[PDB]
């Protein structure tokens, strides 16, 4: 009956979402740098790029009308302000920027662009569109300024988005996983990776891909839910280290 | 196997609209409200300031099953100003309000987490789950809401030290705030805040507070955090 | 020319607040369970009892128009929720409460009351309220539930009271102190004084009186500090433990 | 003995008041924007998105005196909705707020700090302190608002983990959240915006913003934290 969208969807919280989605009957369009073999529709593309976005966008309105729009691509990095050769290069913080923070406006703005004159559900929806932040929007660690900076502009980007699309009965959320295994993680040694899942309240783990995607999938059918930064984190609190 | 489950503030409302999505669910539910009511619930009819009261509810449940999910949705609203015409906002209204819905939830929440301790683990390795409710009010105060959202802010700042400690026995802590809901707690005053829900544009409706309840039981990631649930509703001074 | 009125002024951040606003001119009186032997107006009372609160509001209007309010009484509270014999007594939570809550409710109602037809100054303020919570109330440790929740309605209660007040011309600020030599750290032993000492990235040491203090007087003296709580905590962000 | 201080954004505004504030309190302050003013200040002309002109900037103030004080305070601004009435919001127009507001304060925090890495700490044990400039976009950002929002909550997630790291160096880095003030920066929208400001009621003044940044400057214990400094105001859809 609906199409989605899912960027980031060749893998980890993107891949869980995607086939929740599919399982709940949507008609599931993934936009990737890479493609997989799971039972979607692969368009591979960059966030970044508004020309992918809107192929990816346009694929999913050729299915059926789009409803959910769910951005998880994004990247990691650890790096300190102050190296051993010199200060945190401005580059790698640009690309950063560019992928986790730029990439989630575009994909905003053009989903919601197609969407705006999707005939409304029951509720008045035309869509929702789910974003995926990381609490280290709010307790950024040492050596997370680039990430911890791109999460920050997406939790911001939230409250305006959502006050103007209501008008347009399109929905904006955002929820900040706490560890699970995203670019963050993999950017890290063992010694790092433990030390880091040692932190976890409870569930004294790392965060299941599954339990994303079921927190995206109820945001989907709960009306109320709005404008809002979730945490999705056991309790996580970074400390400095 | 079956579970218990304690909702307080069960009698109507967001409490009733848990109570009964719990009980749909599976869950052997009891509440614990100043009143009973008519719907296929167990009731105890009691107060969440004293310890009596909810050690009896805590029990009701138990006697039903082992208790697992814990919703405490009792409370009592207020508007009255700092400054008002013949003097300052009364001391003892403060003290009820903060009693009732920051107490009342602290003593539940004791009162239940000791009566789970010792629950084998579920799968999960959960052996229980509290949701309590505060108010978007903890956040945004509108101008007669002092006592309302001093109150619920407490609720929002107990969520992290508890959920912190009760990690360790695989109990969860969450809050739920909502914005304005479909309850039966001036004409004036609910239209100027109806006015200002970006979407939907409407009340909540009790079943959606349910709903996001129910998620949190069921999603063992959801931890030490608020949930707004408020339409992204930030009320203004007025 | 303009009164103060400090509670909790016989010891740690609320002295060093009233000795900063008497040096500073202000006509100073002080509400504290205690005296002490400061060239200060002591007022030995409990800031739950309303009697108590509106006796050093008049002594301090006395002396001359009470423009500075300072609540800075409080207690600290160690208690798991979980203990040894059983849960977290519901008694020790309700003090905690009254003292720091109902206490801070308490001096802002009657202060304001109080201040209300005071002549506005240039900056068309009345008097200005400041009241104390703690890096508690956003991130509590395990032990201290009652402390943080007690904290937490400090905290929220600053933006309504600011909002009505505003109409009165009385600002309320609220700051929040990470970790310095209060009843939070006077309540625990050495083992932890130290750990907890060790969270703290800059300054790493205990924060020093007058440092509140400085904070508070330059709340007094900038009119656009309205309605928001200030942490003052060296990016202390407290770990479980 | 004296030191330096380099104001970016310093020819109007926030970074004026600031910078004049500073060389009124001893500092031998150097002003970086993209145009020079006729102030008793030294200027650099430059962009804060260019390592060249930054770094130029950071060499002049040095030239002085050791650099002990920062103050990013260059901005842009943008009022440009999602969905516009032939099509989205540019991604060029969201890119450029980014790169000036974000990656700008960025560019000049790092770069800055690499400079007082080495510098002798001073009584309190500080080699320098960064003040970052955002908004109260960040956190209630109106209708219009997207992009200047989201480079201003970049800027407010930047500070702990930027203070955490420079708390080794004994570096600070503070940032401040503006509400209205009254910078060179529709007669409907700013008349809607002063209406929603409890008090003062009325725009905030370059020299209340410079207040504060100096005493950031002064007390020790104020690092990793955002502070508002709105007059109370939370800013509505519009
Ligand atoms: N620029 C990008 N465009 C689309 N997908 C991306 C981009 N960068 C990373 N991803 C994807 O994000 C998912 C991780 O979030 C990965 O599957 C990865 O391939
Ligand atoms: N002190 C209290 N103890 C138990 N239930 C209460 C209390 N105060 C209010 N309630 C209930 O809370 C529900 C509203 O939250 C109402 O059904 C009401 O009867
Ligand atoms: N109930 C109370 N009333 C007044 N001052 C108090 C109270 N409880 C603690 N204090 C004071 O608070 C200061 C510590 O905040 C101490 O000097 C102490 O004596
Ligand atoms: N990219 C930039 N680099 C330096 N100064 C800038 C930049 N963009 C805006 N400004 C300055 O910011 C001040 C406003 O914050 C203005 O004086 C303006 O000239």
Redesign the interface.
């Given at each position: 009956e609906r199409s989605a969208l899912v960027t980031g969807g060749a893998s980890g919280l993107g891949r869980a979402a995607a086939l929740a989605l599919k399982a709940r009957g949507y008609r599931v369009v993934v936009l990737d740098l890479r493609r997989e073999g799971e039972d979607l529709i692969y368009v591979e593309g960059d966030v970044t790029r508004?020309e992918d976005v809107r192929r990816a966008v346009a694929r999913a309105q050729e299915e059926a009308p789009l409803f959910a729009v769910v951005s998880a691509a994004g990247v990691g990095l650890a790096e300190?302000?102050?190296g051993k050769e010199?200060?945190?290069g401005?580059e790698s913080?640009?690309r950063v920027?560019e992928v986790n923070?730029?990439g989630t406006?575009?994909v905003?703005?053009?989903a919601?662009?197609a969407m705006?004159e999707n005939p409304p559900d029951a509720?008045?929806?035309r869509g929702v569109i789910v974003n995926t932040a990381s609490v280290?929007?709010?307790?950024?660690?040492?050596?997370?300024?680039?990430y911890?900076?791109?999460?920050?502009?997406?939790?911001?980007?939230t409250?305006?988005?959502?006050?103007?699309?209501?008008?347009?009965?399109?929905?904006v959320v955002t929820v900040a996983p706490?560890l699970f295994d995203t670019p963050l993680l993999q950017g890290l040694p063992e010694k790092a990776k433990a030390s880091l899942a040692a932190?976890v309240?409870?569930?004294?783990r790392l965060?299941?891909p599954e339990?994303?995607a079921?927190?995206v999938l109820?945001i989907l059918?709960?009306?109320?839910?709005?404008?809002?930064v979730?945490?999705?984190?056991?309790?996580l609190?970074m400390?400095?280290r």
């Open positions: 508004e300190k302000i102050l010199g200060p945190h401005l913080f640009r920027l923070l730029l406006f575009n905003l703005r053009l919601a662009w705006r509720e008045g929806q280290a929007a709010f307790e950024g660690q040492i050596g997370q300024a680039a911890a900076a791109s999460k920050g502009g997406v939790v911001a980007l409250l305006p988005a959502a006050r103007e699309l209501a008008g347009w009965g399109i929905r706490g932190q309240p409870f569930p004294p965060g299941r339990e994303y079921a927190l109820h059918e709960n009306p109320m839910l709005n404008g809002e979730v945490r999705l984190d056991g309790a609190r400390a400095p």
